[PDB]
Each structure stands twice: as structure tokens, then as C-alpha cells.
PDB file of C-alpha atoms in Angstrom:
ATOM      1  CA  UNK A   1      -0.043   0.083   0.011  1.00  0.00           C
ATOM      2  CA  UNK A   2       1.012   3.639  -0.703  1.00  0.00           C
ATOM      3  CA  UNK A   3       1.411   4.562   2.776  1.00  0.00           C
ATOM      4  CA  UNK A   4       3.785   7.010   4.792  1.00  0.00           C
ATOM      5  CA  UNK A   5       6.650   5.609   7.065  1.00  0.00           C
ATOM      6  CA  UNK A   6       7.297   7.609  10.223  1.00  0.00           C
ATOM      7  CA  UNK A   7      10.264   5.584  11.797  1.00  0.00           C
ATOM      8  CA  UNK A   8      13.334   4.327   9.987  1.00  0.00           C
ATOM      9  CA  UNK A   9      14.930   0.826  10.167  1.00  0.00           C
ATOM     10  CA  UNK A  10      13.064  -2.054  11.993  1.00  0.00           C
ATOM     11  CA  UNK A  11      11.790  -0.089  14.821  1.00  0.00           C
ATOM     12  CA  UNK A  12      10.420  -3.039  16.834  1.00  0.00           C
ATOM     13  CA  UNK A  13      12.060  -1.989  20.069  1.00  0.00           C
ATOM     14  CA  UNK A  14       9.452   0.092  21.142  1.00  0.00           C
ATOM     15  CA  UNK A  15       7.098  -2.906  20.973  1.00  0.00           C
ATOM     16  CA  UNK A  16       9.285  -4.283  23.785  1.00  0.00           C
ATOM     17  CA  UNK A  17       8.101  -1.427  26.007  1.00  0.00           C
ATOM     18  CA  UNK A  18       4.336  -1.738  26.217  1.00  0.00           C
ATOM     19  CA  UNK A  19       4.814  -5.411  27.026  1.00  0.00           C
ATOM     20  CA  UNK A  20       6.188  -4.023  30.348  1.00  0.00           C
ATOM     21  CA  UNK A  21       2.942  -2.196  31.091  1.00  0.00           C
ATOM     22  CA  UNK A  22       1.566  -4.917  33.220  1.00  0.00           C
ATOM     23  CA  UNK A  23      -0.433  -6.173  30.307  1.00  0.00           C
ATOM     24  CA  UNK A  24      -0.143  -9.796  30.918  1.00  0.00           C
ATOM     25  CA  UNK A  25      -1.924 -10.882  34.168  1.00  0.00           C
ATOM     26  CA  UNK A  26      -1.255 -14.357  36.031  1.00  0.00           C
ATOM     27  CA  UNK A  27      -3.569 -17.032  34.701  1.00  0.00           C
ATOM     28  CA  UNK A  28      -6.385 -16.401  32.446  1.00  0.00           C
ATOM     29  CA  UNK A  29      -6.373 -14.029  29.428  1.00  0.00           C
ATOM     30  CA  UNK A  30      -7.158 -10.300  30.408  1.00  0.00           C
ATOM     31  CA  UNK A  31      -6.029  -9.102  27.096  1.00  0.00           C
ATOM     32  CA  UNK A  32      -9.186  -9.561  25.312  1.00  0.00           C
ATOM     33  CA  UNK A  33     -10.974  -6.573  26.917  1.00  0.00           C
ATOM     34  CA  UNK A  34      -8.336  -3.854  26.627  1.00  0.00           C
ATOM     35  CA  UNK A  35      -6.785  -5.272  23.476  1.00  0.00           C
ATOM     36  CA  UNK A  36      -9.883  -6.543  21.835  1.00  0.00           C
ATOM     37  CA  UNK A  37     -11.855  -3.337  21.018  1.00  0.00           C
ATOM     38  CA  UNK A  38      -8.458  -2.828  19.373  1.00  0.00           C
ATOM     39  CA  UNK A  39      -8.715  -5.715  16.935  1.00  0.00           C
ATOM     40  CA  UNK A  40     -12.179  -4.350  16.413  1.00  0.00           C
ATOM     41  CA  UNK A  41     -10.591  -1.277  15.831  1.00  0.00           C
ATOM     42  CA  UNK A  42      -9.254  -2.640  12.915  1.00  0.00           C
ATOM     43  CA  UNK A  43     -12.803  -3.608  11.713  1.00  0.00           C
ATOM     44  CA  UNK A  44     -14.582  -0.404  12.199  1.00  0.00           C
ATOM     45  CA  UNK A  45     -11.708   1.088  10.478  1.00  0.00           C
ATOM     46  CA  UNK A  46     -13.395   0.032   7.320  1.00  0.00           C
ATOM     47  CA  UNK A  47     -16.252   2.735   7.849  1.00  0.00           C
ATOM     48  CA  UNK A  48     -14.492   6.026   7.106  1.00  0.00           C
ATOM     49  CA  UNK A  49     -16.449   7.815   4.234  1.00  0.00           C
ATOM     50  CA  UNK A  50     -13.875   9.852   2.414  1.00  0.00           C
ATOM     51  CA  UNK A  51     -15.933  13.164   2.375  1.00  0.00           C
ATOM     52  CA  UNK A  52     -13.638  16.333   2.820  1.00  0.00           C
TER      53      UNK A  52
END
């Protein structure tokens, strides 16, 4: 896709930063509440009528 790159060179070291935000909880999966509407956030993303 013809997008725009903000960072330069494999910048996946910042992604090893949010994993330290007490995301994973002991037992069970509590990452389907606060990281689900997200996934959903890539769903509703397909409803933006280009009307400028």
C-alpha cells in the first residue's frame, strides 16, 4: 500500500516497551478487553467515508 513511514529501520524495540505495562496477568487472559476493541478497531476502521 502507498502509505507513509514515520520511523526508520526495524523499529520493533518500542514494541518491547508496552509489554512492560503490566499487560499480561497471572493465569487467564485479561488481554481480550483492553486489547480486543483494538482488533475491533481494525474492523470499524473500514467505515470512514472519504468526504472532505
